[PDB]
């Protein structure tokens, strides 16, 4: 019995909070060099054990939630935002159920409907960018995705009510996943704490009556909202209007931030690699034809390069940069015993660019998958949607949304860096944001 | 007319204070990769232009003090500590004559006195270390250097006044070389500013009566103190008591911090490379005789390996990490004009470890000089003592001190790392200080 290498720190309480805050990826890779796949360090009077590489990460992915707990760590931030009796508020077994329900709502039939829906929103949104210029993609994209994710995941009724004042109510809920909300106790009245709660009431308010306007009209609609309203536990019990509104919040935020960032990033990887951009456009005409008809689900599958570009964006810029659990009981990896109390973490970012396995690691090269790579050679080197019990459910949908949008976009414009500036990464927010994401765009010929 | 490349910061007043603060070598090397030999950034209101590599740094080394000015940057820190009328308190031509007088004292005849003085001091000091154990070398060495430096640079009388309190006064003096003291204005009543001012007045006092005593008694002693007392500007004017006492302070602070740090790291480099350490010990027998008699100045020139070990230590661990100047008139390098007002900088650390010029840059290898290297091959790739109007005058004395000390130390002990630990660098204060610099030692065979 031996516990992980511990990284001592001179600072009394902060610990590594400043160095890790600067560049977490730099911090963690160096730590990998000095100490290996398994190490501990303290930050803000908290101890963290990291697991790097596929083998060590296996601990986290394979374990049972009674052993590595996700509520113990996520709940602080989630419950105030999403709502009571949903996500990390309920026992895991109850949550597995809520997932199985949502998952059902993400099936080919619904995606088929989504493609055109998304393609419309994209075309219409960009009517105000005209023929050329230099604008903020990340800003645009997150505005559009809030629109597309809404139409798809919240149905027509709710989407038609998305104005500026609702956009703000969501933006107030973004300010819940913060530095301060994780450490400080929920009785210190920071401005954000207050707004996060205000918007939660105001938005559940909107969902409350929008639910029932569908709970009534006999107009048979087959969408995500419908699925939820019709679904049922092993109990037989249906979801209360509270539960339903709850998981509507989860759906919008999860499905909105993770796609915007990714989409936004791919824009720059594509504008930087101009030939790779043109082969993406060429692939569009090959798979869809010169006339370029509207898009259908069936065409997406044959957009292989585009798929590998998305797979490559997610490799280098995974929206979920870290994943965490509380050790409720002692766990063993690489001969080390992690003591109950440590917060265990894995970083897809580190794993997916690790030197031992990713050849030309910092290169944006979608052709890497047409070779030998750890994404197939190994179980947990490529993990942008996680693995095991806490596995993502949105991957199908996320690919649908990003695929359609970028297809449509490559059809509308050609994109270039401004003076050859490729955005750097900001860590001020959990949200993996690109520095100064303004892009040059001219009409496609 | 092109100004240097500018690295932007989002953080408003601070700038890069934290990124640079935590790892300046990393920050600067990274910068060098992205931006080139010349670039600029701002920190705490101030703007810096760094000149990395032999060619960029040539601008600073060659420049006149009218154009690139030392006083403007150094004087706030310096004058309260060394005193008025000396170093940066006076016009540069005045200071050059003082450098000249200080040089005249650092000659072969005095060095021959220093050798046996240092040897005896070292043997006496380490008696308390005993046959083996685990002590903090950096403390030991700094304690010791203070005794050897005084003995050589102040003389026998002043040395015999060196008790705990006087040592404590000198430490209050260094407190003046603070992060804080360069930034915040001098009219603030911080604890350290008071400490410094008080201890300045008390050392000056000790030096006053000491100067007057030697000025009196007719015993003819030929040391450095007397060189100063017998010295004279082109004026024909002798030094006022306050001028002598001033440079005597500057002499000990200079001759102390720089040697102690260098000897500390050398210690750890030789503890890591045991086979190198052994070769150094053998050299002592080969050069000085198997009998190992008392060290002489002539023997010092012959310890070539020990020589290159010091040189190699200075390469990786120069105690003056950065040289700085204020731009008064506009200056051009690599096609860029540094606007007046910028603080122009060179890092020896960075120049001495630069990828494109050093084979195995991070490697402690004293033999690298027996091949082809930038020390001999470029002009300014190797500059631990600087170059130009502001060149160091203390190099020879510094080698004498560090040779004699390490010669005697090797004869006394075999040194080792504790549990494989090599001290990492502590940058908080600008001096390369070793983290937890405790060494294992045992009696030499
Ligand atoms: O020896 C070099 C070491 O010295 C410096 O550390 C000082 C530091 O500045 C201060 O923070 C303070 O430390 C106090 C500390 O803050 C408190 O957390 C506590 O420490 C206890 C730990 O909480 C507890 O974990 C346990 O520690 C044991 C470890 O759990 C166990 O893993 C093992 O540790 C070994 C590591 O596994 C291994 O990696 C290696 O450690 C290297 C470090 O990673 C590296 O950072 C460095 O450490 C420096 C440090 O930078 C200095 O600031 O070098 C190490 C290379 O050897 O080796 C570790 C064992 O040496 O064993 C430890 C116990 O030995 O108990 C500790 C207390 O022992 O209280 C601390 C009060 O001292 O002071 C330290 C001491 O100099
Ligand atoms: O892509 C640009 C940039 O976007 C972000 O920057 C924002 C920043 O966070 C805010 O602080 C603010 O900027 C204010 C700034 O802080 C003030 O100093 C001032 O800026 C003026 C300068 O003081 C002045 O020097 C001059 O700048 C000219 C330079 O002198 C000249 O050398 C050249 O600069 C180019 C460099 O030579 C070249 O290396 C390259 O620099 C890269 C940066 O290092 C990199 O960080 C990135 O910057 C992002 C940044 O990360 C965001 O935070 O861009 C470069 C990569 O190519 O490029 C430089 C530009 O070509 O030219 C400039 C003139 O443009 O003028 C500026 C006034 O613009 O005022 C600012 C008040 O807004 O806002 C910015 C918003 O972008
Ligand atoms: C590119 C897009 C996305 C990426 C990269 C992504 C990533 C992830 C990751 C890494 C996890 C695991 C977290 C952990 O184990 O702690 C996860 C889980 C999850 N995701 Fe996503 N996600 C994306 C989009 C979505 C979408 C669109 C939805 C909803 C439709 C969604 C809903 C969920 C849910 C319900 C979980 C499970 C939480 C649990 O069981 O603890 N995600 N996702
Ligand atoms: C390990 C030993 C030493 C090293 C590495 C070292 C390094 C340096 C450097 C880099 C400079 C140039 C500063 C600049 O250009 O901004 C300098 C200058 C100087 N040093 Fe040293 N030094 C050492 C020892 C000494 C000693 C022992 C003395 C006293 C005998 C001394 C006295 C001086 C003086 C008077 C200057 C000139 C200041 C000026 O003209 O601006 N140094 N030294
Ligand atoms: Cl309906 C729903 C229910 C639960 C989640 C958990 O979402 C993830 C983020 N995420 C985004 C997309 N897929 C995952 C998450 C949220 C908050 C925290 Cl503190 C930690 C994590 Cl890992 C998401 C949607
Ligand atoms: Cl008598 C005497 C007079 C002047 C100096 C110059 O001292 C250097 C450090 N140093 C130490 C040994 N050789 C140089 C220095 C002093 C102050 C500042 Cl703010 C910055 C620097 Cl780089 C040294 C001795």
Swiss-Prot record, chains A, B:
Q: What class of enzyme is it?
A: oxidoreductase
**PTM comment:** Ubiquitinated by MARCHF6, leading to proteasomal degradation.
Where primarily located?
endoplasmic reticulum
Which CDD domains does the UniProt record give? CYP51-like
Q: Where in the cell is it found?
A: Endoplasmic reticulum membrane; Microsome membrane
The catalysed reaction is: a 14alpha-methyl steroid + 3 reduced [NADPH--hemoprotein reductase] + 3 O2 = a Delta(14) steroid + formate + 3 oxidized [NADPH--hemoprotein reductase] + 4 H2O + 4 H(+); lanosterol + 3 reduced [NADPH--hemoprotein reductase] + 3 O2 = 4,4-dimethyl-5alpha-cholesta-8,14,24-trien-3beta-ol + formate + 3 oxidized [NADPH--hemoprotein reductase] + 4 H2O + 4 H(+); 24,25-dihydrolanosterol + 3 reduced [NADPH--hemoprotein reductase] + 3 O2 = 4,4-dimethyl-8,14-cholestadien-3beta-ol + formate + 3 oxidized [NADPH--hemoprotein reductase] + 4 H2O + 4 H(+); a 14alpha-methyl steroid + reduced [NADPH--hemoprotein reductase] + O2 = a 14alpha-hydroxymethyl steroid + oxidized [NADPH--hemoprotein reductase] + H2O + H(+)
Q: Which residues bind heme?
A: 392
Q: Which biological process terms from the Gene Ontology are attached to this UniProt entry?
A: cholesterol biosynthetic process; cholesterol biosynthetic process via 24,25-dihydrolanosterol; negative regulation of amyloid-beta clearance; negative regulation of protein catabolic process; negative regulation of protein secretion; steroid biosynthetic process; sterol metabolic process
Q: What is its EC number?
A: 1.14.14.154
InterPro entries hit by this protein: CYP450_sterol_14alpha_dmase, Cyt_P450, Cyt_P450_CS, Cyt_P450_E_grp-IV, Cyt_P450_sf
Q: GO: which molecular function terms?
A: heme binding; iron ion binding; oxidoreductase activity; oxidoreductase activity, acting on paired donors, with incorporation or reduction of molecular oxygen, reduced flavin or flavoprotein as one donor, and incorporation of one atom of oxygen; sterol 14-demethylase activity
Keyword match Disulfide bond:
no
Superkingdom of this entry's organism?
Answer: Eukaryota
Cofactors: heme
Query: Could you tell me which PROSITE patterns the record lists for this protein?
Result: CYTOCHROME_P450 (PS00086)
The record's tissue-specificity note reads:
Ubiquitously expressed with highest levels in testis, ovary, adrenal, prostate, liver, kidney and lung.
This protein's UniProt keywords:
Cholesterol biosynthesis, Cholesterol metabolism, Endoplasmic reticulum, Heme, Iron, Lipid biosynthesis, Lipid metabolism, Membrane, Metal-binding, Microsome, Monooxygenase, Oxidoreductase, Steroid biosynthesis, Steroid metabolism, Sterol biosynthesis, Sterol metabolism, Transmembrane, Transmembrane helix, Ubl conjugation
Pathway it works in: Steroid biosynthesis; zymosterol biosynthesis; zymosterol from lanosterol: step 1/6
What does the record say about its membrane topology?
Single-pass membrane protein
PANTHER family xrefs: 24-HYDROXYCHOLESTEROL 7-ALPHA-HYDROXYLASE, CYTOCHROME P450 FAMILY 7
Q: Which family does it belong to?
A: Belongs to the cytochrome P450 family.
Q: What does this protein do?
A: Sterol 14alpha-demethylase that plays a critical role in the cholesterol biosynthesis pathway, being cholesterol the major sterol component in mammalian membranes as well as a precursor for bile acid and steroid hormone synthesis.
Question: Know the name of this protein?
Answer: Lanosterol 14-alpha demethylase
Q: Which organism is it from?
A: Homo sapiens (Human)
**Could you tell me the gene encoding this protein?**
CYP51A1
């Amino acid at each position: 019995v031996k516990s992980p290498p511990y990284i001592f720190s001179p600072i009394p309480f902060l610990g590594h909070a400043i160095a890790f805050g600067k560049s977490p990826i730099e911090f963690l890779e160096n730590a990998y060099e000095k100490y290996g796949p398994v190490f501990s360090f303290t930050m803000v009077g908290k101890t963290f054990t990291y697991l790097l590489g596929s083998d060590a990460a296996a601990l986290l992915f394979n374990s049972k939630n009674e052993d590595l707990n996700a509520e113990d760590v996520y709940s602080r931030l989630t419950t105030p935002v999403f709502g009571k009796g949903v996500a990390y508020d309920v026992p895991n077994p109850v949550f597995l159920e809520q997932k199985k329900m949502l998952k059902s709502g993400l099936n080919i039939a619904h995606f088929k409907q989504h493609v055109s829906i998304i393609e419309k929103e994209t075309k219409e949104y960009f009517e105000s960018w005209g023929e050329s210029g230099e604008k903020n993609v990340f800003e645009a994209l997150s505005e559009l995705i809030i629109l597309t994710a809404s139409h798809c995941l919240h149905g027509k009724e709710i989407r038609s009510q998305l104005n500026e004042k609702v956009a703000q109510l969501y933006a107030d809920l973004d300010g819940g996943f913060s530095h301060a909300a994780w450490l400080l106790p929920g009785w210190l009245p920071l401005p954000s704490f207050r707004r996060r709660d205000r918007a939660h009431r105001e938005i559940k308010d909107i969902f409350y009556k929008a639910i029932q306007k569908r709970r009534q009209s006999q107009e048979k609609i087959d969408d995500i909202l419908q699925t939820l309203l019709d679904a049922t536990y092993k109990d037989g019990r249906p979801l209360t209007d509270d539960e339903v509104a709850g998981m509507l919040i989860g759906l919008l935020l999860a499905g909105q931030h993770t796609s915007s960032t990714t989409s936004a990033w791919m824009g720059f990887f594509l504008a930087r690699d101009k030939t790779l951009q043109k082969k993406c456009y060429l692939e569009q005409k090959t798979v869809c034809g010169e006339n370029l008809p509207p898009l259908t689900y069936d065409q997406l599958k044959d957009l292989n390069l585009l798929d590998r570009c998305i797979k490559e964006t997610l490799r280098l810029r995974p929206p979920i940069m870290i994943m965490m659990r509380m050790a409720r009981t002692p766990q063993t990896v690489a001969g080390y015993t992690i003591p109950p109390g440590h917060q265990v973490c894995v970083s897809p970012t580190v794993n997916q660019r690790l030197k031992d396995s990713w050849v030309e690691r910092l290169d944006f090269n979608p052709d890497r998958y047409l070779q030998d790579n750890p994404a197939s050679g190994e179980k947990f080197a490529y993990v942008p949607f996680g693995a095991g019990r806490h596995r993502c459910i949105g991957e199908n949908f996320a690919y649908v949304q990003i695929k359609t949008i970028w297809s449509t976009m490559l059809r509308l414009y050609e994109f270039d860096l401004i003076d050859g500036y490729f955005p750097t990464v900001n860590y001020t927010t959990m949200i993996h944001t690109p520095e100064n994401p303004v892009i040059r765009y001219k009409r496609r010929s």
